Amino acid sequence: KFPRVKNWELGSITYDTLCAQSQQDGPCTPRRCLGSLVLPRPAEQLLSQARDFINQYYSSIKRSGSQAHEERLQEVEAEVASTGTYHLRESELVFGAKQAWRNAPRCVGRIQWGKLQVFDARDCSSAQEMFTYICNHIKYATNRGNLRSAITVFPQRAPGRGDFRIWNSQLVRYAGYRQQDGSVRGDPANVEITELCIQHGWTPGNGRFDVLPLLLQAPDEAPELFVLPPELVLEVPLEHPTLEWFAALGLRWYALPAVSNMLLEIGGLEFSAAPFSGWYMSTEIGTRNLCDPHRYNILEDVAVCMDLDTRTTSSLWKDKAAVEINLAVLHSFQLAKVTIVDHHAATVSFMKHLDNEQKARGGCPADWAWIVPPISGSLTPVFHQEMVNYILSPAFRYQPDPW
Amino acid sequence: GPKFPRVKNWELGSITYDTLCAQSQQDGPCTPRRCLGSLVLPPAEQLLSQARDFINQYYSSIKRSGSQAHEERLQEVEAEVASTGTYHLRESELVFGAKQAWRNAPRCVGRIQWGKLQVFDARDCSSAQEMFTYICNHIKYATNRGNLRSAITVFPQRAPGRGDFRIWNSQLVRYAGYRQQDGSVRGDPANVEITELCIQHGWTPGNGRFDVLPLLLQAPDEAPELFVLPPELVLEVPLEHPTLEWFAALGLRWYALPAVSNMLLEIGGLEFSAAPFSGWYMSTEIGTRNLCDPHRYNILEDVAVCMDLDTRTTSSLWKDKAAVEINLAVLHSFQLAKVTIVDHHAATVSFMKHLDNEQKARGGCPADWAWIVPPISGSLTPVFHQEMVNYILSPAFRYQPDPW
Ligand code: HEM
Ligand code: HEM
Ligand SMILES: Cc1cc(N)nc(C[C@H]2CNC[C@@H]2OCCNCCc2cccc(F)c2)c1
Ligand SMILES: Cc1cc(N)nc(C[C@H]2CNC[C@@H]2OCCNCCc2cccc(F)c2)c1
Ligand SMILES: C[C@H](O)[C@H](O)[C@H]1CNc2nc(N)[nH]c(=O)c2N1
Ligand SMILES: C[C@H](O)[C@H](O)[C@H]1CNc2nc(N)[nH]c(=O)c2N1
Ligand SMILES: [Zn+2]
Structure with missing residues (x-):
């Protein structure tokens, strides 16, 4: 048993x-x-x-x-x-x-x-008050880079009533704009939520890294839109220890991973x-966010900058570029004095x-x-560890999107 | 639904x-x-x-x-x-x-x-010696001088009521692992037991990191018999790197034919x-698991030192960088020698x-x-993003207890 x-x-x-x-x-x-x-299911x-x-x-x-x-x-x-x-x-x-x-x-x-x-x-009775709480949470958790x-x-x-809900999946997320040419400017994971923000009266930017506004919902009310003041949202420009051109890519990420829809x-x-x-583990940003093909999908751009041979799988250009991107994330966060953990340490x-x-x-x-991390799995000790999976309570759960 | x-x-x-x-x-x-x-x-x-x-x-x-x-x-x-x-x-x-x-x-x-x-x-096989003939024919056919089949x-x-035909070795080709007086292992630490069984049964052992093991073959109700594979039958690939010239000086090698024999x-x-x-290898099997597992050849540190990486801190990604080069060395060396191999992307x-x-x-x-999902670069390959259902269908291969 x-x-x-x-x-x-x-x-x-x-x-x-x-x-x-x-x-x-x-x-x-x-x-x-x-x-x-x-x-x-x-x-x-x-x-x-x-x-x-x-x-x-x-x-x-x-x-x-x-x-x-x-x-x-x-x-x-x-x-x-x-x-x-x-x-x-x-x-x-x-x-x-x-x-x-x-x-x-x-x-x-x-x-x-x-x-x-x-x-x-x-003791929160309105979307306005939700916003104030959320803002204090952000300021507290960020703590000038020393994340808590x-x-x-x-x-x-x-x-007897509708739920309090934050429509965004995270408190800080980058917009995704569907283009006439069927591509996506910004983060393709956030297309639907970007569109909802616009529907509810947001003036959208046109960047690859536009911090989305929050859609906050008090019971049985239409969600309300709140722009996070940019001074609250700590971000990290991505540069590379040895590769001078990397910073020219204009890449960045936000400091605070804050899940808001569970x-x-x-x-x-x-x-x-x-x-x-909490704080990020580097692979979340370096590997999944920037390298997933249905996300920012930057692997090829980076490999071409590295002048790697992209014609064939067996030169391992993908693996090579993936390491450098993860390294850039670690280096830049450490430089900006923002808490981060690499996948080996974690x-x-x-x-x-x-x-x-x-x-x-x-x-x-x-x-x-x-x-097990999404690069170098077996290089980490968790790969070699058997694990039993099952549900204990108190728990976090997934819930339906409120729209 | x-x-x-x-x-x-x-x-x-x-x-x-x-x-x-x-x-x-x-x-x-x-x-x-x-x-x-x-x-x-x-x-x-x-x-x-x-x-x-x-x-x-x-x-x-x-x-x-x-x-x-x-x-x-x-x-x-x-x-x-x-x-x-x-x-x-x-x-x-x-x-x-x-x-x-x-x-x-x-x-x-x-x-x-x-x-x-x-x-x-x-x-129709009825002796341990005939098992050996059968196995040598399989190895020759499968290896096909590098065009693997x-x-x-x-x-x-x-x-x-009758005893089993058994091959004691887990693969037809495996490297010896010799337990040392300093508690360390020379060769492949995964093979310490089978190596020790081979010596008990009369194999005169080597003293290298890549000594091909003999076969221990058991016909029904008989004690197992020892057979040395003639070296001309066992195709091996010396490992070198495309750009890192010193890599060949490490004396690393692997065999061509992955042949599971105890299932x-x-x-x-x-x-x-x-x-x-x-069949034939996927490159990560050799470059990542066999060479880099802490409980196998464990070469990550040696290679990273040769690459002059900072091995004092996790956040240099020294482990990730060395692993990639070892994997590229495996692909390149197999390609050069014209031995069938597939990388984890194409696979x-x-x-x-x-x-x-x-x-x-x-x-x-x-x-x-x-x-x-391969042991390096998981989410870079399309299978990471694919939900899978696992269940047992028959016919099947099964693990079975070691016969000793
Ligand atoms: C302190 C630093 C933390 C780190 C480095 C960390 C790391 C991670 C990672 C890597 C995952 C897998 C996420 C993915 O790849 O999608 C995860 C999931 C999760 N974390 Fe943590 N975490 C931290 C803090 C927290 C905190 C404070 C909580 C709640 C109080 C939390 C609750 C969860 C839950 C519920 C999941 C599963 C969510 C899902 O299924 O997407 N974590 N975490
Ligand atoms: C043709 C080239 C082949 C490749 C590239 C291949 C690749 C692999 C890989 C990567 C694994 C995971 C095992 C591990 O990493 O430890 C595996 C497992 C397995 N393979 Fe294949 N294989 C090939 C041919 C075959 C053939 C011909 C058979 C048998 C007829 C076979 C039967 C199995 C079985 C039963 C397992 C699971 C048992 C185990 O190793 O735990 N494979 N194979
Ligand atoms: C608190 C915390 C700290 C940290 N470092 N990392 C985390 C994981 C989130 C951020 N990095 C990815 C995870 O995001 C959480 C959401 N999970 C994505 C998968 C998903 C879920 C539900 C529905 C879907 F359609 C898809 C949390
Ligand atoms: C036929 C074929 C082709 C190919 N490319 N790859 C393969 C898998 C074997 C070789 N590369 C690793 C696999 O070896 C299989 C043996 N290991 C299974 C796990 C296990 C169970 C119990 C005890 C242990 F120590 C280990 C087969
Ligand atoms: C603990 C875990 O089940 C175990 O380490 C597995 C993980 N995945 C693997 N995957 C492959 N292909 N081969 C392996 O030996 C393992 N080992
Ligand atoms: C299909 C598969 O379960 C899915 O891609 C999972 C795999 N493992 C993961 N592991 C982490 N940490 N985060 C993820 O999003 C996923 N995605
Ligand atoms: Zn299960």
């Missing part, structure tokens, strides 16, 4: 016992594995998730089974029985947010899980706007996290295909 | 549904509670139903399902089982089944070539415990084409994403 987990570089073995705490099914069955898929239930989560909280502060634990369980029962829902205490919300990050199987940054600033924005993990939590979902689930309560940020620290979690919890849910 | 897994390509935005998985009759390790896809290792009644299924596959493949010859073959199979407990394949059925087992292998990126496989029937040699199947071939309930198969491009072929022909293709 408990799976054996082996590391093939070192020959070491552990057993995951934590997986038995899973209450939520993933996409696999004994007939077929679907672990490579990106997205997923009443009082009694809420009450039991609420109890489990409260048990988790009192166990975390070592006060499991005390009177405060007992009376808090009664408070939750009393509230659900009367209202069909309940509310979290602030410190509970703080615990739940850290735990949702801890439990995220696709996150390689989890050694940092215990260090998270939690902003309680549950943060989450801001807007009011929970309520059965749902935060704690004790059966759902927070549909709960944006969170995966080493992830291995340590796995060992920490083994001792603490008897395992760690991990999604191998997301943990 | 259809009641079958939906499979997306995220580069292109295209969708398919896998209906082939419905044909799987064997459970993998995953459940609704937990995914275990990253784990490397996983009577007459049972046999008869596997047999019937295989015979139906055979007759469907020649477009003769339901026909007299199909029903007669079925009757023939159950009569043979009813009186002996086993049965035997016709020659053309073995050929079909071998190719099908390769086509069904979820972890193989080379499957576009599945229809082109030379199937050597060695089901896919091949499989099939020795006799498991029989009840079990299952066809219709029948188990062929000895059926070595071979994955042709695997996508294979996925498209199989969608039309069978309605899906079992594929293990973590194995299909």
Whole structure:
């Protein structure tokens, strides 16, 4: 029942016992594995998730089974029985947010899980106020380049109404403009969201790196548009340690990776706007953002600058240009004094996290295909590490686009 | 949407549904509670139903399902089982089944070539010495002086109460790994045990990093016998770099023929415990895994020092830079020597084409994403962006316990 987990570089073995705490099914069955898929295909239930989560909280502060634990369980029962829902205490919300990050199987940054600033924005009643919270979050998290993990939590979902939602997938994203010639200027991942901004009254730029405005939505209201003041949005010009021409490419990226469209689930309560940020691992920018063919797709441009032979796969021009771009990202961030981690350092620290979690919890849910970096996979220790993937709560989830 | 897994390509935005998985009759390790896809290792009644299924596959493949010859073959199979407990394949059925087992292998990126496989029937083999003759013929044919050709040699199947035909070596060609007094390993550390078994069984060992191992071959109920491959049969490629002149001075080399020799071939309930198969290398197998794994030759640091990189800090990407050059050295050296090899870009491009072929022909293709994606430059290849469904179809190759 408990799976054996082996590391093939070192020959070491552990057993995951934590997986038995899973209450939520993933996409696999004994007939077929679907672990490579990106997205997923009443009082009694809420009450039991609420109890489990409260048990988790009192166990975390070592006060499991005390009177405060007992009376808090009664408070939750009393509230659900009367209202069909309940509310979290602030410190509970703080615990739940850290735990949702801890439990995220696709996150390689989890050694940092215990260090998270939690902003309680549950007293927010308008899109305008959402914006103020978001701006303070950005300023805090950015901290002049010395990035600090943060989450801001807007009011929970309520059965009698529409959700608070941030329409953007990230707080900072570059616009993508579809052209008459069918190409895309800017970031092709953000075409649809750029078009929505324009529909809701934004005057668009014409650059490759136009920071998008935010579409913020209070319950049952049309989303409202807010331009982030450019002084809040820290960006890094990309240059190269040895290649002088690289800077001429005019490439840049923003400092703050801040996911804004996922749902935060704690004790059966759902927070549909709960944006969170940390700092980048270099491959996210250098490899995926700039090199993906359905993104900025710069590989060929860069290789031609390097005067590589582009005529054939076997000169490994792609691999060569990809390394230089990742190096440029590392160099430029370090030069601009902005927090960044390379994929070797991050995966080493992830291995340590796995060992920490083994001792603490008897395992760690991990999604191998997301943990292993998108260049030089087997050069990192996580490649050689077997991993068990499963869903624990508190959790982050995907949710439908609100349009 | 259809009641079958939906499979997306995220580069292109295209969708398919896998209906082939419905044909799987064997459970993998995953459940609704937990995914275990990253784990490397996983009577007459049972046999008869596997047999019937295989015979139906055979007759469907020649477009003769339901026909007299199909029903007669079925009757023939159950009569043979009813009186002996086993049965035997016709020659053309073995050929079909071998190719099908390769086509069904979820972890193989080379499957576009599945229809082109030379199937050597060695089901008459009766000694360890004859296994050696068969293996030498396979190696010569497959190597073809560098113009490599896919091949499989099939020795006799498991029989009840009778011992197995086994090749102890994991591949027909492997380098020795000698444990040193300083605790280190000279040669390939993956091969420490088999090397030590060969010496026990009377091999006089070398003292190099690239000593070709002898074969340990086991006929039914006999102790295994040792056979040295005549060196003229084992094609090897000395490694050099196109621009970095000192690379050749490292004395690195690899062999031409990747020939897996310890896997079990299952066809219709029948188990062929000895059926070595071979193709040609994808360059990352050698340049990235065999040469750069910390637990293999582990040459990353040596090469990066030669390249004069800053090995004191992760963020110089010294590991990534050296790896790329080692991989380019592998491609270049194999090309120069005119030995068949394919890079990870061309290999994955042709695997996508294979996925498209199989969608039309069978309605899906079992594929293990973590194995299909190459170990350098993953997201630079098109398979990274392709969702995959993994399941077990039969005929199949299986891992089997080491015989010692
Ligand atoms: C502190 C620095 C952090 C680093 C270096 C980091 C790194 C990463 C990486 C590389 C991924 C895979 C993303 C992709 O390639 O699409 C990821 C995913 C994820 N991270 Fe982290 N992360 C950090 C902080 C955080 C924080 C603060 C949270 C929440 C509080 C978080 C929650 C998540 C979640 C839920 C995912 C999965 C999202 C998805 O499926 O796209 N991470 N992270
Ligand atoms: C024609 C050129 C071929 C290429 C380039 C190729 C490539 C590969 C690669 C890269 C793997 C992943 C293994 C690893 O990295 O450890 C693999 C696995 C596999 N291949 Fe292929 N292959 C070829 C031919 C064949 C042939 C002829 C067969 C058998 C008839 C075959 C059967 C298998 C099987 C059963 C596996 C999974 C077993 C394992 O190694 O774990 N391949 N192949
Ligand atoms: C907090 C944090 C820090 C960090 N360094 N990195 C991250 C991952 C995000 C940024 N770099 C990529 C990830 O973006 C998150 C969104 N995931 C993209 C895949 C996806 C999801 C849902 C629907 C789709 F259609 C597609 C988070
Ligand atoms: C026929 C063919 C052609 C080709 N290019 N490539 C191949 C795969 C083999 C060679 N390059 C790596 C693979 O070797 C397969 C053996 N390893 C499987 C994993 C494993 C399991 C148990 C214990 C272990 F130590 C390792 C086959
Ligand atoms: C299809 C496949 O699952 C998809 O391309 C995944 C693979 N691994 C990944 N890993 C990370 N970290 N981020 C990603 O976006 C993806 N994409
Ligand atoms: C832990 C993980 O399952 C293991 O290291 C796998 C990953 N992917 C692989 N992919 C291939 N092609 N070959 C391998 O040996 C491995 N090793
Ligand atoms: Zn699975």
